[PDB]
Amino acid sequence: GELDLPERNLDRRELRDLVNELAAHPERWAEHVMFPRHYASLHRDAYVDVWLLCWRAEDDTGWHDHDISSGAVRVVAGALKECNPRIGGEHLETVVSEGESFSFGPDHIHRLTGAVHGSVSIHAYSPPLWRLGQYSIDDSGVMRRVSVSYA
Amino acid sequence: GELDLPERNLDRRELRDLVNELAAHPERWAEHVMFRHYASLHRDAYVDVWLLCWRAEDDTGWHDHDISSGAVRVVAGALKECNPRIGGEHLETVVSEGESFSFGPDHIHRLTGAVHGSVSIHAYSPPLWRLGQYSIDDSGVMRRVSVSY
Numbered sequence: 001g002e003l004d005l006p007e008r009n010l011d012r013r014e015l016r017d018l019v020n021e022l023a024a025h026p027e028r029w030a031e032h033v034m035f036p037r038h039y040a041s042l043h044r045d046a047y048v049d050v051w052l053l054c055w056r057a058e059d060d061t062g063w064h065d066h067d068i069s070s071g072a073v074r075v076v077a078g079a080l081k082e083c084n085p086r087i088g089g090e091h092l093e094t095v096v097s098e099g100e101s102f103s104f105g106p107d108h109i110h111r112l113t114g115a116v117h118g119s120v121s122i123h124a125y126s127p128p129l130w131r132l133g134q135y136s137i138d139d140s141g142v143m144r145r146v147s148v149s150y151a
Numbered sequence: 152g153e154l155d156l157p158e159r160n161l162d163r164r165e166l167r168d169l170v171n172e173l174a175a176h177p178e179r180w181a182e183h184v185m186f187r188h189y190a191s192l193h194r195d196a197y198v199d200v201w202l203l204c205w206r207a208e209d210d211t212g213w214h215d216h217d218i219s220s221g222a223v224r225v226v227a228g229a230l231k232e233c234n235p236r237i238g239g240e241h242l243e244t245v246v247s248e249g250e251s252f253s254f255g256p257d258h259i260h261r262l263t264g265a266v267h268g269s270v271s272i273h274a275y276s277p278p279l280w281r282l283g284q285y286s287i288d289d290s291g292v293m294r295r296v297s298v299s300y
């Protein structure tokens with residue numbers, strides 16, 4: 001079935017424990033490994049959403065926030081680049097490789113890209129990722145944020 | 152006070168029309184000028200309309216309006232509207248008395264540098280239930296705090 005999680009929101013630390021423990025339980029996700037993006041929902045209810053992501057080298061989230069959702073990421077196989085925006089334009093880039101995880105609160109703005117072909121990652125959000133902010137730049141250079149429904 | 156409007160969220164052109172219409176009807180807002188101090192002119196399921204009196208120190212900070220379109224009419228004085236540019240050389244526009252502007256729901260801006268005693272009318276649709284307020288670390292990494300209002 002779906003995952004058997006608490007009936008409440010999880011904080012950042014709890015979300016990071018969740019994605020790491022799921023990674024140690026391939027019975028919960030191996031079936032859903034599928035390469036195109038391709039994402040597969042492992043769990044979606046009123047408190048938490050969990051997705052399994054299978055990456056191609058070209059895949060790119062764009063710059064986004066998660067509105068009011070905290071989140072965590074565990075890389076199961078391969079490696080991703082987590083990028084954080086800086087107003088100067090010299091953005092911070094970190095490689096996250098197999099075995100590693102990180103979490104963030106709801107104020108986070110980031111971009112995931114640069115994956116090794118075939119990478120696999122588990123992403124959890126609490127409260128659920130029902131809204132995402134997608135940033136874009138005009139030819140002027142002026143930045144905008146489009147709020148998108150993900151429910 | 153109730154406003155004769157379509158029973159639906161309004162677009163940015165409709166909101167600009169609204170703020171300019173209200174600016175032409177001082178009988179509706181003149182009583183509420185007070186020196187941002189703010190007075191609600193009308194709030195319902197579809198729109199929020201505010202009168203704002205500015206001091207020279209007032210500053211919204213950088214923010215978005217989540218899913219709300221908006222419009223501003225400067226009734227007296229002047230405001231600076233600024234729009235952020237990657238690179239740090241932000242676009243700045245002085246909006247003087249008599250002038251108005253509107254924007255869709257993707258806008259990021261900051262209002263500040265008001266002549267002392269400026270008066271403006273602001274309308275949002277859908278209502279401004281949530282705002283995103285941007286901040287930096289001393290590292291320089293930008294964050295967005297979602298504020299319920």
Ligand SMILES: [Fe+3]
Binds near residue numbers: 064066
């Ligand atoms: Fe994300």
Ligand SMILES: [Fe+3]
Binds near residue numbers: 216260
């Ligand atoms: Fe605003």
Ligand SMILES: [Mg+2]
Binds near residue numbers: 021
């Ligand atoms: Mg165990």
